[PDB]
Amino acid sequence: TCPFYKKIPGTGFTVDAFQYGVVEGCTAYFLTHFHSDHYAGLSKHFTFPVYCSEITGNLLKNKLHVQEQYIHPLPLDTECIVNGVKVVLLDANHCPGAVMILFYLPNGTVILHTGDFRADPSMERSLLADQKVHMLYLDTTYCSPEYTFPSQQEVIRFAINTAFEAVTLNPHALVVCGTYSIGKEKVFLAIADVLGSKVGMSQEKYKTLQCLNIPEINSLITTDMCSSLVHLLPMMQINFKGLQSHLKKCGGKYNQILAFRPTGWTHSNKFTRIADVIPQTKGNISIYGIPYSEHSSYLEMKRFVQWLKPQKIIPTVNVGTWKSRSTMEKYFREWKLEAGY
Numbered sequence: 001t002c003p004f005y006k007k008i009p010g011t012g013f014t015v016d017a018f019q020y021g022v023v024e025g026c027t028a029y030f031l032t033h034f035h036s037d038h039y040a041g042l043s044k045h046f047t048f049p050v051y052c053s054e055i056t057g058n059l060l061k062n063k064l065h066v067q068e069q070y071i072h073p074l075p076l077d078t079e080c081i082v083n084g085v086k087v088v089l090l091d092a093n094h095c096p097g098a099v100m101i102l103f104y105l106p107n108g109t110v111i112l113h114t115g116d117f118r119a120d121p122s123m124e125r126s127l128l129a130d131q132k133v134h135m136l137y138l139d140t141t142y143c144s145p146e147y148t149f150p151s152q153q154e155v156i157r158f159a160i161n162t163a164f165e166a167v168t169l170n171p172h173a174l175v176v177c178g179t180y181s182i183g184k185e186k187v188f189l190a191i192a193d194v195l196g197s198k199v200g201m202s203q204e205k206y207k208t209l210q211c212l213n214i215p216e217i218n219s220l221i222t223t224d225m226c227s228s229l230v231h232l233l234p235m236m237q238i239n240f241k242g243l244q245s246h247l248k249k250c251g252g253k254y255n256q257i258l259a260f261r262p263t264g265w266t267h268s269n270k271f272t273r274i275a276d277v278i279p280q281t282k283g284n285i286s287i288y289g290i291p292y293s294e295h296s297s298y299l300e301m302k303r304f305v306q307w308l309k310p311q312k313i314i315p316t317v318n319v320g321t322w323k324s325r326s327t328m329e330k331y332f333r334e335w336k337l338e339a340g341y
Ligand code: NI
Pocket: 033, 035, 094, 116
């Protein structure tokens, strides 16, 4: 049974609610982005209207085989009428094709559902600037002040400088980057650009990347692993055993691996600056954990909410424990008292 924080009152709509069977009263199912916890339940047998971005609809059709007649892609930053209700899709600064959804209810209430997002000051000059928002369905993944991490730009500078140094010292070093979902493509694309290489990967991952509308992508990726010195592997294989085994398969072309695991936050963030990050090393294999986040830090979240000034907040993450729910409610009240709304 569909939980209340996935339902939009005063409409026939749900958000990210495909794992509950036929939801009573639902006339249109929205999908914020193509991450498995959110699409859970969709397949070629789904026969209700799905509303999403162009990029998410490419993934639904090619990866999950949803039939074309049920996919309803909408342009961004554009007022659209869906089943009698005005909606807008906004870029969520999460993974490719990820959106926030503005719903303009027939009674005059305005609701923003962030999906998953990484708040940014640039959002303060989107179509959000233009009206009041009553209710905020908020991605609270990192809603506690311990969650700090650097900008994506600082993290990418670290990765590029680290990979270029290693491979210039040793032209026989291979770079490997872990992945298990879409998102974070800048990590492996920036490293391959500095090295003058295409990124090599499985046919299944190439297929996924080809759905993403990234400019000049045919110039940047390949399935020919032998021609590439940046390889993508499943995240599960980014350990000493898995990397040893990969280096065997390369036929003595390489004699060292430098590997990256883009995580979200880890508690090494509470002590260490990006500049000071060091790898775990065993023999000729080194593994860097880099804090590349596609969700808001606590401070970025707080700035967005204090700017928006919603009347009510409904968290969408960390809702399963009373301690989490009580912590989040305390911060929402602090923010409101400090800013005066
Ligand atoms: Ni996500």
